[PDB]
Amino acid sequence: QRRIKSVSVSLPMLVGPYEDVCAQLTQTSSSYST
C-alpha cells in the first residue's frame, strides 16, 4: 500500500528577522483517494 501521511514546506529567503512571510496553499485534489 501507499498513502500520504503529512508534509511541510519552506523558503530560504531571509525576509528579515520577522517580516511578512505570507502565502497560501492547497491541493486542488488528491485525485486518487480511497
Add this chain to the structure above:
Amino acid sequence: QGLGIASLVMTVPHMSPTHWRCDLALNKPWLLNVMNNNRGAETCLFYRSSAQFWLDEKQLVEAAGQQPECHLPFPMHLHWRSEIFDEITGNRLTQEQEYAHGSWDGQEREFRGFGRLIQRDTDGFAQVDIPTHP
C-alpha cells in the same frame, strides 16, 4: 575591503534591513611607508594584500574559465610597488612586484612562497620625444 585588519560590522535585527559597516582606515599600520635622506631621497612604499592578490588571480583566471586553487589560503599583507623621484628634475620611476601561485605548508603551516613572480617598471620624464618602455 581587504585592509588586512578588521573593518567594523554590525546588524540591527529590528527593521527588515539590518547591516552596517563603519569605516576605519586605509592601511595596515606601522609599515615603514617612506624613508628619506636629507640629500633629498624618498621611498614611496606601496603595499597590498596578498589575499587581494589571490582574489584577483582567482577572478582573472576565472575570466580565463580555469579552475582556481591557490595553495596559499593564509592571509598576509605584503609590499607591492614603489615610486622614486628625481629630487631636482622631477622625473621619476615606478617599480612593481607581482606574483602568483601562492603556497602554504599543508602540514607545517608555513609560507611556501609564490611559484611565479612578475616584475615590472618604468622611468618617466617631464619631457621631449623619448618614449619609456616598461
